[PDB]
Copies of this chain bind each other. A is one copy, B any other.
Amino acid sequence: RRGILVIRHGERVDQVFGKSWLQQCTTADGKYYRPDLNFPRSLPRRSNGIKDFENDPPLSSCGIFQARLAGEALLDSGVRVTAVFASPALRCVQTAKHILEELKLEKKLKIRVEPGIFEWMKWEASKATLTFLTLEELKEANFNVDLDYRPALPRCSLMPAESYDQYVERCAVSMGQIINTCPQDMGITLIVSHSSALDSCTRPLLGLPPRECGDFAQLVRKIPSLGMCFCEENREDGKWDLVNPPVKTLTHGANSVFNWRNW
């Protein structure tokens, strides 16, 4: 039975450190340093400027841990992973890469970057000025991205102004293409995306109409990092079913800031 596993990206650096995080780890001359171990050991080169990290932040160290833990679990489970698609957001491509590394499939499977499964533009505060890394930039940063993949939606076609209806439609169109982006291959396809995608990228498969915007927004608001929903195809009955994911959930606590000098 063919499967579609929608996976939320890991923890973002700005979720922990706030909107000013870039100021916290760069000099006036823009030299990177790590003021807390949860900042990553390096940033990829952004040829449009480090400032594009504000709109399009990387995973924190903990987010990398979560992604790798999920990949290791997927390996342990024995499922056959057959393809992976990712939102163009850095946090999503990085989540995909770290899952693949622990599956030991990062050389075997190329990441298919699909702007059609990007976040709802309304929720991207950056939207007007938002810039993803290009495929060539991703390749230069040692992401094994599919340079030959023709996306359902090119990035130039994402609309800052997209409505909820336009958002849910493009996800359905995107998922429709993705499900045909493989004749007969037995195994699971990873969809590495945003909280919104656990709803917007599964309901179309399940033949369900879109949720009312308010209901959708409420359901999607508190999906944790690496949160998963899994759909399996019943091809005889011509339908998809919502099914328990092939790996367990991940629950862990926080780690608070600590200043030794306070004693």
Which residues of A come within 8 Å of B, CB atoms?
11, 15-17, 34-38, 41, 60-62, 65-66, 69-70, 72-73, 76, 198-199, 219, 222-230, 242, 244-245, 247-263
Closest residue on chain B to residue A33 by CB atoms: B248
Question: Which chain B positions have C-beta within 8 A of A258?
Answer: 222-224, 227-228, 249, 251
Min CB–CB distance A116 → chain B (angstroms): 21
Closest residue on chain B to residue A216 by CB atoms: B263
**Interface residue from B11, B61, B76 paired with A69 (Cβ < 8 Å):** B61
CA distance A34 to B247 in the complex (A): 10
CA distance A186 to B63 in the complex (A): 36
CA distance A256 to B199 in the complex (A): 18
**Interface residue from B36, B224, B228, B261 paired with A251 (Cβ < 8 Å):** B36
Beta-carbon contact of B76 and A256 below 8 Å: no
**Interface residue from B60, B224, B226, B263 paired with A252 (Cβ < 8 Å):** B60
Beta-carbon contact of A252 and B250 below 8 Å: no
CA distance A36 to B70 in the complex (A): 11
CA distance A229 to B260 in the complex (A): 6
Min CB–CB distance A91 → chain B (angstroms): 14
* A260-B245 contact in complex given A37-B73, A69-B37, A76-B41, C-beta closer than 8 Å: yes
Min CB–CB distance A9 → chain B (angstroms): 12
Question: Which chain B positions have C-beta within 8 A of A17?
Answer: 251
Beta-carbon contact of A62 and B61 below 8 Å: no
* A256-B245 contact in complex given A62-B65, A65-B65, A69-B37, C-beta closer than 8 Å: no
* A256-B260 contact in complex given A62-B65, A65-B62, A70-B37, C-beta closer than 8 Å: no
Question: Which chain B positions have C-beta within 8 A of A72?
Answer: 41
5 interchain residue pairs of minimum CB distance: A62-B252, A37-B250, A229-B260, A65-B65, A254-B254
User: Most chain-B CB neighbours within 10 Å: which of A199, A230, A254, A258?
Assistant: A258
Question: Which chain B positions have C-beta within 8 A of A224?
Answer: 255-258
Beta-carbon contact of A252 and B61 below 8 Å: yes
User: Most chain-B CB neighbours within 10 Å: which of A34, A242, A248, A255?
Assistant: A255
